[PDB]
Design an enzyme around this catalytic site. Structure first.
Site, PDB file in Angstrom:
ATOM      1  N   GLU A  35       7.648  -7.382  -6.746  1.00 52.44           N
ATOM      2  CA  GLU A  35       8.362  -6.750  -5.642  1.00 52.44           C
ATOM      3  C   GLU A  35       9.853  -6.622  -5.963  1.00 52.44           C
ATOM      4  OE1 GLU A  35       7.280  -5.172  -3.240  1.00 52.44           O
ATOM      5  OE2 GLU A  35       5.246  -5.874  -2.803  1.00 52.44           O
ATOM      6  N   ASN A  46      12.242   3.821   1.227  1.00 57.35           N
ATOM      7  CA  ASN A  46      10.929   4.452   1.274  1.00 57.35           C
ATOM      8  C   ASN A  46      11.047   5.883   1.780  1.00 57.35           C
ATOM      9  OD1 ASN A  46      10.165   1.302   2.567  1.00 57.35           O
ATOM     10  ND2 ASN A  46       9.541   1.943   0.508  1.00 57.35           N
ATOM     11  N   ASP A  48       9.642   7.351   4.159  1.00 53.17           N
ATOM     12  CA  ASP A  48       9.637   7.471   5.615  1.00 53.17           C
ATOM     13  C   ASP A  48      10.980   7.072   6.232  1.00 53.17           C
ATOM     14  OD1 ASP A  48       9.649   4.718   5.343  1.00 53.17           O
ATOM     15  OD2 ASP A  48       7.669   4.401   6.221  1.00 53.17           O
ATOM     16  N   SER A  50      12.439   4.081   5.997  1.00 51.29           N
ATOM     17  CA  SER A  50      12.573   2.634   6.097  1.00 51.29           C
ATOM     18  C   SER A  50      13.073   2.100   4.760  1.00 51.29           C
ATOM     19  CB  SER A  50      11.244   1.979   6.481  1.00 51.29           C
ATOM     20  OG  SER A  50      10.280   2.128   5.453  1.00 51.29           O
ATOM     21  N   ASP A  52      13.004  -1.520   2.099  1.00 50.48           N
ATOM     22  CA  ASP A  52      12.470  -2.835   1.759  1.00 50.48           C
ATOM     23  C   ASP A  52      13.607  -3.750   1.318  1.00 50.48           C
ATOM     24  OD1 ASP A  52       9.929  -1.678   2.175  1.00 50.48           O
ATOM     25  OD2 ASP A  52       9.808  -1.073   0.072  1.00 50.48           O
ATOM     26  N   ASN A  59       9.909  -4.954   4.902  1.00 50.53           N
ATOM     27  CA  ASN A  59      10.207  -3.589   5.311  1.00 50.53           C
ATOM     28  C   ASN A  59      10.796  -3.497   6.716  1.00 50.53           C
ATOM     29  OD1 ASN A  59       8.855  -0.802   6.578  1.00 50.53           O
ATOM     30  ND2 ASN A  59       9.737  -0.578   4.530  1.00 50.53           N
ATOM     31  N   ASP A 101      -0.493 -11.556   9.832  1.00 44.31           N
ATOM     32  CA  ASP A 101      -0.647 -10.364  10.665  1.00 44.31           C
ATOM     33  C   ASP A 101      -2.083  -9.845  10.730  1.00 44.31           C
ATOM     34  OD1 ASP A 101       0.477  -8.308  12.338  1.00 44.31           O
ATOM     35  OD2 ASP A 101       0.316  -6.920  10.647  1.00 44.31           O
TER      36      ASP A 101
END
Ligand SMILES: [Cl-]
Ligand SMILES: [Cl-]
Ligand SMILES: [Cl-]
Ligand SMILES: [Cl-]
Ligand SMILES: [Cl-]
Ligand SMILES: [Cl-]
Ligand SMILES: [Cl-]
Ligand SMILES: [N]
Ligand SMILES: [N]
Ligand SMILES: [N]
Ligand code: NA
Ligand SMILES: [Pt+2]
Ligand SMILES: [Pt+2]
Ligand SMILES: [Pt+2]
Ligand SMILES: [Pt+2]
Ligand SMILES: [Pt+2]
Length: 129
Positions: A35, A46, A48, A50, A52, A59, A101
């Site tokens: 990562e 990203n 979209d 967003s 990280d 995120n 989650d």
């Protein structure tokens, strides 16, 4: 901060990540490697909109606030900048919420594609723990 492999393993153990939700320390070190390459200050935008953040590239669409991700949530209740600290407490606390989650560590795409099913124990081999 750019952690050493065994240095990060020790830190992650200290902060309660070994076997957290059943994921051995090697899984967490492996995820961090691919990562962020163990760099706490790692950021990546990203498509979209967003971003990280941190050693585990958490995120902004769901987990932290950076003030520039429209419609996003902040479920870890932290500024995304907190995930860039030399102290990994914020990242660890948030990662615990993420891995709980429902989909486990599959939430980290790099983990699923590069760590899952592999000899992850190799990532803590030789380390004083
Ligand atoms: Cl390494
Ligand atoms: Cl392991
Ligand atoms: Cl936002
Ligand atoms: Cl904030
Ligand atoms: Cl730390
Ligand atoms: Cl912690
Ligand atoms: Cl799981
Ligand atoms: N901790
Ligand atoms: N902690
Ligand atoms: N730490
Ligand atoms: Na957000
Ligand atoms: Pt640093
Ligand atoms: Pt901790
Ligand atoms: Pt904890
Ligand atoms: Pt390396
Ligand atoms: Pt620490």
């Amino acid at each position: 901060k750019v952690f050493g492999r065994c240095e990060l393993a020790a830190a992650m153990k200290r902060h309660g990540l070994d076997n957290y939700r059943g994921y051995s320390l090697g899984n967490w070190v492996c995820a961090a490697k691919f990562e962020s390459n163990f760099n706490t200050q790692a950021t990546n935008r990203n498509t979209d909109g967003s971003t990280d953040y941190g050693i585990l590239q958490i995120n902004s669409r769901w987990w932290c606030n950076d003030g520039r991700t429209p419609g996003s949530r902040n479920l870890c209740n932290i500024p995304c900048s907190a995930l860039l600290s030399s102290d990994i407490t914020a990242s660890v606390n948030c990662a615990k919420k993420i891995v709980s989650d429902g989909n486990g560590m599959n939430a980290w795409v790099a983990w699923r594609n590069r760590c899952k099913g592999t000899d992850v124990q190799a990532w803590i081999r030789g380390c004083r723990l």
